[PDB]
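Can you give me the bound-state structure? Components:
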Amino acid sequence: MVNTVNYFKQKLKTEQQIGMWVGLADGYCAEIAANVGYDWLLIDGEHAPNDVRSILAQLQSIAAYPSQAVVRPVSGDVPLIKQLLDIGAQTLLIPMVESAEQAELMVKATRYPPEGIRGVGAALARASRWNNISDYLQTADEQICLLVQVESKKGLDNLDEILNVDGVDGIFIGPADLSAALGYRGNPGHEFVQNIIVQTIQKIRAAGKAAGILSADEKLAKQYLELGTEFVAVGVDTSLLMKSMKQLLSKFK
Amino acid sequence: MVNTVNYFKQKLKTEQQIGMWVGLADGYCAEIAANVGYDWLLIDGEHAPNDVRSILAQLQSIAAYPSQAVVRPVSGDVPLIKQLLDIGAQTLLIPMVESAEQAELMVKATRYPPEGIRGVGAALARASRWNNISDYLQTADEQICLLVQVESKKGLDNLDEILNVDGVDGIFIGPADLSAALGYRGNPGHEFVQNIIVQTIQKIRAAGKAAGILSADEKLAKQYLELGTEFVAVGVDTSLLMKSMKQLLSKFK
Amino acid sequence: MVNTVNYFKQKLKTEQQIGMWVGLADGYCAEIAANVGYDWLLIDGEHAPNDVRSILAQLQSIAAYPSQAVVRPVSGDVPLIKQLLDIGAQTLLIPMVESAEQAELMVKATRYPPEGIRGVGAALARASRWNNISDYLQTADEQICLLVQVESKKGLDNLDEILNVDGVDGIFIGPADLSAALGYRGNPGHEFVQNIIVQTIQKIRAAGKAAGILSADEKLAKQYLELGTEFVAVGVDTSLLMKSMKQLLSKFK
Amino acid sequence: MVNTVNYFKQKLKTEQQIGMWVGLADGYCAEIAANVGYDWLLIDGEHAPNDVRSILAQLQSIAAYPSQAVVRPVSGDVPLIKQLLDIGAQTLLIPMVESAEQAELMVKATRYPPEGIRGVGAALARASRWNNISDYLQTADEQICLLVQVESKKGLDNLDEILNVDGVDGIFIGPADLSAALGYRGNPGHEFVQNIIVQTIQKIRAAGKAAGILSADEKLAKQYLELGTEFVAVGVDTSLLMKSMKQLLSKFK
Amino acid sequence: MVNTVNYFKQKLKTEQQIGMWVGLADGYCAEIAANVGYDWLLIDGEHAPNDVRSILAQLQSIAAYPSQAVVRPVSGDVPLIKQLLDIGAQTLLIPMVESAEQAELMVKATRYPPEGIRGVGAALARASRWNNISDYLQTADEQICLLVQVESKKGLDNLDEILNVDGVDGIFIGPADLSAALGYRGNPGHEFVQNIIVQTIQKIRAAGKAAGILSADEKLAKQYLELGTEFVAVGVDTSLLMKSMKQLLSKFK
Amino acid sequence: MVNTVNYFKQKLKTEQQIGMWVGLADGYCAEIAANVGYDWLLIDGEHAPNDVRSILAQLQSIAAYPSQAVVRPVSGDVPLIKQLLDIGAQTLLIPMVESAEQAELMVKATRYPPEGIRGVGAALARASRWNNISDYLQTADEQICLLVQVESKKGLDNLDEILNVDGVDGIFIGPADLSAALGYRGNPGHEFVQNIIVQTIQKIRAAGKAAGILSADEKLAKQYLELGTEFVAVGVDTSLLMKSMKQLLSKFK
Ligand SMILES: O=C(O)C(=O)C[C@@H](O)[C@H](O)CO
Ligand SMILES: O=C(O)C(=O)C[C@@H](O)[C@H](O)CO
Ligand SMILES: [Ca+2]
Ligand SMILES: [Ca+2]
Ligand SMILES: [Zn+2]
Ligand SMILES: [Zn+2]
Ligand SMILES: [Zn+2]
Ligand SMILES: [Zn+2]
Ligand SMILES: [Zn+2]
Ligand SMILES: [Zn+2]
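Here's the bound-state model for the whole set.
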């Protein structure tokens, strides 16, 4: 067996990938989402009630389908990053990255020694298919994709420095955390917030990195795609489930 | 503590209750459904991957909300009925009921001896809140609601007989099983099927029982409500999740 | 490795075994109970929310401790009996046994062919420790203990016939189901019910079988032990947890 | 999406498929087995501690790999068969089938009405991918494969009658159950048993059905393959795990 | 829907709340505790085997009852605090708080930016009921209650400083950790320890904060209530389960 | 009850203990491993998908058998160490220890105050059997065994300083991590690496500490045992499961 190709990573330079947030925290729900045809699914370990074992179940469900899995850990925790890579998550989205130094540590956390600090345990890892991928320790690093979130003032204050870090494949803008940080909590649609988001997208792409974002607003999402934003999540399973059930009930009250 | 009042059961005689099918087989998904404001939630033990323990988790989730829980067991199995009643399911929907004799056995399965055959284990039961409901063994039978599905030719062949069974509170028409039984598998909307469903609804109400049905078709659901159908499910969580994610992706392909 | 000796089965003829009902349906709770020093623990698959997998977890927890595990299936279901024997339950308590014919089928359900109908799958079974007990298929039958519950009028109407069945090691009286069957639901303490229980215990022991019973009433439990009742459960974990927490709160209201 | 093609079913007529028993009852263990390259994996619901939910997890694990899943229910229970088909098991192995009448009921249990009695619930089923397989109710029956076990004297007494049942795709011989039934429990290797197995394989293939068998004995497995046996399981994960760990320890004692 | 009112938080100023420690780490056990009528339940993420997902199940169980849930995380970890707030824990008890700077960080960890560092993910959170609480991002901070444990010498060395932190609603004294820190491990009842606890309670109340404590000792608990201690836990479910089963067995040995 | 004697800890000074890596992350798989007769089983919380709750299940499985449990946390995290000790893990293997200061903190993390910083919660702990071990707070420290991994250049740069830390019972060499650190990733067999391992084992034993190592290579494992290495793991369950199933398939292709 050859290592699983990270098509999400390759497509960062060839197309615009449409994403779905997966926070139902469940193998069975993850599989329903996997049947739709999204370019990528974000398994949310930060804002959905997930742990390593529930993320593994969802990776196993999604693996039969073409949708590419991206995992968001709760934080940029080196040992948690090790755990998520070994269950075979090939793309990670690190929340609240605020310096070149933190971004550099996240790069190393995804690469084997001697160049990185990823803990070595290939005999035990779904990532290596328990060494059924015979050359995994040689081919692993190339199919790993690192995304970092800029979603705070300090993040924006260190944007040019983060964009200079080799091994950061993409910067993803978090409008909820960023609008809150800017004193517009719950109102990311405000012009003050949107002008910073557009400028930020433009700066990311000018430094040769992939830009990403989440908006459940169809107009905002289409605007980001027109700017050339490489990875755009367009909704959230929890939100779509709630809204679809409320919209149906309102037809009958 | 006084026994939980079965408002679903009381409302069978006073209003038309709007229902949502719950097949996501998950305590967390069940809570999302419970927040919407449906009159009733059908926790599907027949066609979703549920067991007693997953049904228990969903009852615990829904219990904090006004939505009334109805549980469908995989079949009219007396021991399984016993199990679902003790975890505190107060309304049961029995699939594929086909004679007065089977409906009578389902009535007895829901009532304590000496009048019924419900196994007695109140010290262990969430149903009694582990005897924190001090008179549960006296007050239980009153708050239990039995619904039976007519969804086969034999069922329609025994409809008058089933409708004469004291203890059957409601008959629910299953259009998927019934359309298939009639040789119109996948096409319940056909006039042949619909005329039999309308006639069946009319006969159920004429015998003083509650009539129920599921249709994801808004026009068919509104027609059944106009006929006075007492319990009408209008959608399915798995269906709404899939459709909502597909509809969103189609805006971006 | 030699097959696990069924000390519960042996002690039926040498002493009076004190039992604790286990309906918290949980490996961790089962282990707390296992630390107390009961002669036997009844893992309740009839009135607690248990399935094969949760009973297995509790068997694994209890196995490190001297307390002997007894499992009650939801019903006298031959395939469920097969499943519970293979995860390594060596003593079963069958509810609602009402004839010599049903008791004879329960005997066969616990024994390998050609004499019985227990399904053969020793390579897969914790019971054989996955064939690490090298002669399991030869030594299994001898360490299996069958108990049947008499707890209905029909049971009492067939008591002499059930007591004549070879391979029934014990008859256990269920006061909750029996008092309900006799039209004294919730009032097993009534003289009418108690005189039948005492006579029943006396008849069981006169036929050379072990008698068993559950009472949370200390006086009734001590009376049953004075009659020579071989296996007496004296409480229920759910009941003791609820009562201990209520009794503590009442000191502070 | 088109219905998942049952390659196991097709290959019954074109090749000899090498099988592995999966009794570790675990999504993660099922995936390790799926990486090896077995033609088919038997998820054992009869002699491993599995339920609908654990079988679902294992189907989800295995689905990303070419190995075809076969599921053995605990018995020929029509409602359990309905549950396993809806979670998306396309090939079932029914234990202890002993008459043409039982084999006919198993055929019907696997097919939609009006021809069969499979309960209809495509909107909820992983089988239909929640109706993302748009014509599932029309294409389902074709990709379902029914196997029945002959592993008792009464089975052998009804072999010709079972082999005349249209809809039985294969007969699988269970040497553990069959050797016990014949009074050679634990000794299937005996000439008395082996002559009956060989004759039975010959009869199965002469009636135009696929023959199958399990043997962990390499010599017996190769002999069965030389006779033309269509589906041959050659080992059991629990057995291989135990034996590999025992053999390694013995090198160091 | 309006945000869930934190009655625990309001009652810190109006009454003395009686608490029960919940360490059975189980949705079902948590519901049993919820039925008793305790003012508050401490779901222990520090000293019982809990994770985010097991704490979620226990919150869902307890939510149908008046008892207010308080969650103790394993440590004052900002990302874990974020996770427990989003699953909807409205009161946190932070162990081993030892400086004003740590207490200030715990205040910020519980509040949204720009004033705090709580991660924003309301679309995914049970806390917001998945935005069914429409103004959650405006009303959240008000219903969050922060408690900190003083249970070390350094904690006592920084008590005046911690008590001057705005946003700390309560200080909880941990007698096990504090007695151990003072060189009286296992003997909190010693006058040396008790004099420091009473003095500490008095200082907490003098600074206008709520004081709290756990003691399974009825006399010590009543003494702490007589001093005006605002939140007093009086027992532990694991302890009461073990003691109740031991006391019962001793009546029969 | 007296505290569970740590025989692994005692045998570090009296014999050479043969070990098996347990990375199947499963109570049921842990029990199969426990039946074989390994001196010690390493429950891998660093490179297998385990959390506190899955490690608890595996401790409960293994507890009925003589094999001694050793638990590897994902990192040297003081609060996680507290959690694993309270569920009753008596021997910990800390990964990637790189200084005397880190090794000292790990010693303190394993001992109660006042000498250590282990959080005190005996009433809730499987470790104390919920205080059924009456003197646990006095006898705990004695039966706890601390092992640290040297598996990086900085570890080797601090070997003499680590080996002078009182409370470090053993140093375990990780050849996967160490060979990667040395620029020989996937090739621990190289003379450059092996000479450093041998020298390292010699230094460990010369400082009076127990030396340990993992090798699936029988020749390397026997060489390490000939050098006097006190604890030698000789294989990995995931690796043995995969290899056994691959070797069997190859006989039939
Ligand atoms: O040798 C090492 O570094 C270890 O500590 C552990 C083990 O997980 C190996 O990585 C297996 O591949
Ligand atoms: O051979 C048989 O009878 C089988 O059907 C199955 C298998 O479970 C064996 O019993 C393994 O011991
Ligand atoms: Ca289950
Ligand atoms: Ca978990
Ligand atoms: Zn964010
Ligand atoms: Zn139906
Ligand atoms: Zn009973
Ligand atoms: Zn068989
Ligand atoms: Zn404490
Ligand atoms: Zn290592």
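A couple of observations. The pocket of JBU (ligand 2) is lined by residues C 120-124; D 47, 149, 151, 174-177, 214 (CB under 6 Å). The radius of gyration of chain B is 18 Å.
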